[PDB]
Structure 1
Amino acid sequence: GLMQFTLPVRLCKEIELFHFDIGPFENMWPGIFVYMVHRSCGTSCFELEKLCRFIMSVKKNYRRVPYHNWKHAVTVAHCMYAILQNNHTLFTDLERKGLLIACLCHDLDHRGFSNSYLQKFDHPLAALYSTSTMEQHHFSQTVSILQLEGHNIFSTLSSSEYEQVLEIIRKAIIATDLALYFGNRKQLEEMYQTGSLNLNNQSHRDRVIGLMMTACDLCSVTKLWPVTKLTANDIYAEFWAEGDEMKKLGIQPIPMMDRDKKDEVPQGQLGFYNAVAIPCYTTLTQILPPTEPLLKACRDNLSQWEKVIRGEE
């Protein structure tokens, strides 16, 4: 337990900043996550042997898809770490524990296909889970992995704390369903503006955690431009294959997933930054001022997308 995980100097410093990229060395991503848990939560929050075994079963259960893979899991967990570390005093011991795990597990056993495509294919998961289809499956997958022998990192929690953390994680993971984002941010905006927002109201905490989850999930848009751009290529690798699969079912895909509408990528990013990303980080900055660097980074990458369109790159 006197076994403080460390990183090389450049990582030890940059990991603290919102725009840290976890880099291309797959084998360093568990260490980076353990570092983040130990700093965010303590060396005491999880039995190391159980946490490492959990991490490795989570990793095994992410597929080798272009975007919705283990690198995304660990990237989304890093963003949550940076929030939790810039707003240390706002969050319960159970929230700091649960949310880092929520993020790591939030896309477990993703197949590189949208809730839409599952429903149009008529996949058994769309019959088991009518809305937030993949999101309910990811939560299901997380509980299953916690139920494996030697995997229950929540072992030491009381019957109460255990049901609380699983409930934080369940709401956390459901909130990553972007179809639910729009409603949640409208409600948080109005509540903030009418001065009615109350972090003592569990229902309100839930909504705020929901926005954090969206903000971590979308955090490719707050990175250095070359990360933002090279992640977008991975994103279109999934979207276009899905469009191909839609076409095989006899269905015109939406332009966002039609590789024949490549030419319009810059404009679609602009719409997304305006419709989702900018409002998401704007509202998050309002409620959690120290998350301002996410908003500014997003605005910078909006501006790089504008430059693409103007053929200045």
Structure 2
Amino acid sequence: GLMQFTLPVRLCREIELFHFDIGPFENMWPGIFVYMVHRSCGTSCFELEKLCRFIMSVKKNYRRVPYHNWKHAVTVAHCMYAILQNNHTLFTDLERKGLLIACLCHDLDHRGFSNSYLQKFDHPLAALYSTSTMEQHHFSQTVSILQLEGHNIFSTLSSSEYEQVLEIIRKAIIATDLALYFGNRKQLEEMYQTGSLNLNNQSHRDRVIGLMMTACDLCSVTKLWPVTKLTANDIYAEFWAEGDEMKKLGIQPIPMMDRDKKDEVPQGQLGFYNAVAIPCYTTLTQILPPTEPLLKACRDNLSQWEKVIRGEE
């Protein structure tokens, strides 16, 4: 009732920053997440007992893969928290509620394989969800966990509010399908430039939330360089295992997934920051000026990859 969550001083201060790293102590991550809900939403948003039980079931449904794991979920939520806290007035009570939850749940039960590998392996999920395969699965898992006894953190919401929140969550989670991001950022680019962008048009909010989700999801590129570099190892550990699996199916994997192309990593990161990351944080900074530190950090890390290529590290 009168129970606050507090973090040690360095965390208390640094968690407010975009480049915060949640650290290696897994047992502190639930507390960190709850801390973020309480400041971002209010101590009255969710029934504490239910929330903790929800957090633990979510944790239990992430798998021990090198990248798309429980640490990633909490990291993507922390980036969303920073966005929300730096844009206080722009978001409904329901969005604040739904978005941190969406981030925590966005990769639920990920297996460490891309949509493309599932389709080529012909996994049951690819038959059930022909596009955004994993992402529809992630949302499905969120609904399941929400329906477990004592797990309904949205129990105090009205029937229509409940339906609205699940709908924010659904679209948010779908938007993490990077294949959808390009078209989404293009529309947003154009709408901002022709001045048509309207935060009262619901379909416009959706696109903006979608862009936020991409930004949070890629936030590894906005951290301090050693964090960025070390996460990159986890990212390729997954991709290369998928690459191996492609080869097992009799298929040349794309260069990104082929461990024989280890040497081109610095250059693959370059293309990635240029094709994906920078454009994402750019348009996001245009639409939401106080998120500029993400762009600035992303640019610093691109420069670090450039330095890696030039033999300077």
Which TM class, normalised by the smaller chain length? over 0.9
1:49: how far off?
0.1
1:150: how far off?
0.1
SS at match of 1:209: helix
Taking the aligned partners of 1:191 and 1:236, their CA distance within structure 2 comes to 35
1:258: how far off?
0.1
Deviations 1:84-134 (A, max 9, x none): 000010000000000000000000000000000000000000000000000
SS at match of 1:42: coil
Name stretches of at least 5 consecutive residues in structure 2 with no aligned partner: none
Residue aligning to 1:292: 292
Taking the aligned partners of 2:235 and 2:114, their CA distance within structure 1 comes to 12
Deviations 1:204-251 (A, max 9, x none): 000000000000000000000000000000000000000000000000
Deviations 1:42-94 (A, max 9, x none): 00000000000000000000000000000000000000000000001000000
Taking the aligned partners of 2:67 and 2:185, their CA distance within structure 1 comes to 25
Taking the aligned partners of 1:274 and 1:152, their CA distance within structure 2 comes to 41
Taking the aligned partners of 1:235 and 1:185, their CA distance within structure 2 comes to 23
1:175: how far off?
0.1
1:138: how far off?
0.2
- Report the TM-score, using the length of structure 1 for normalisation: 1.00
1:312: how far off?
0.1
Taking the aligned partners of 1:255 and 1:194, their CA distance within structure 2 comes to 38
1:268: how far off?
0.5
Q: Percent identity?
A: 100
Query: Between Structure 1 and Structure 2, how many residues are aligned?
Result: 313
Taking the aligned partners of 1:146 and 1:248, their CA distance within structure 2 comes to 37
1:141: how far off?
0.1
Deviations 1:123-173 (A, max 9, x none): 000000000000000000000000000000000000010000000000000
- Report the TM-score, using the length of structure 2 for normalisation: 1.00
1:84-163 maps to which residues of 2 (within 5 A)? 84-163=84-163
Name stretches of at least 5 consecutive residues in structure 1 with no aligned partner: none
> Aligned-residue CA RMSD in angstroms?
0.2
Taking the aligned partners of 1:232 and 1:196, their CA distance within structure 2 comes to 37
Residue aligning to 1:228: 228
Taking the aligned partners of 1:159 and 1:273, their CA distance within structure 2 comes to 42
Residue aligning to 2:3: 3
Residue aligning to 2:201: 201
Taking the aligned partners of 2:21 and 2:5, their CA distance within structure 1 comes to 19
SS at match of 1:155: coil
Taking the aligned partners of 1:17 and 1:241, their CA distance within structure 2 comes to 33
Residue aligning to 2:169: 169
Taking the aligned partners of 1:211 and 1:267, their CA distance within structure 2 comes to 25
Taking the aligned partners of 2:276 and 2:263, their CA distance within structure 1 comes to 21
SS at match of 2:108: coil
1:287: how far off?
0.4
Taking the aligned partners of 1:221 and 1:250, their CA distance within structure 2 comes to 33
Residue aligning to 1:248: 248
Taking the aligned partners of 1:43 and 1:155, their CA distance within structure 2 comes to 15
Taking the aligned partners of 2:57 and 2:295, their CA distance within structure 1 comes to 34
Taking the aligned partners of 1:169 and 1:311, their CA distance within structure 2 comes to 44
Taking the aligned partners of 1:88 and 1:167, their CA distance within structure 2 comes to 22
Residue aligning to 2:22: 22
SS at match of 2:2: coil
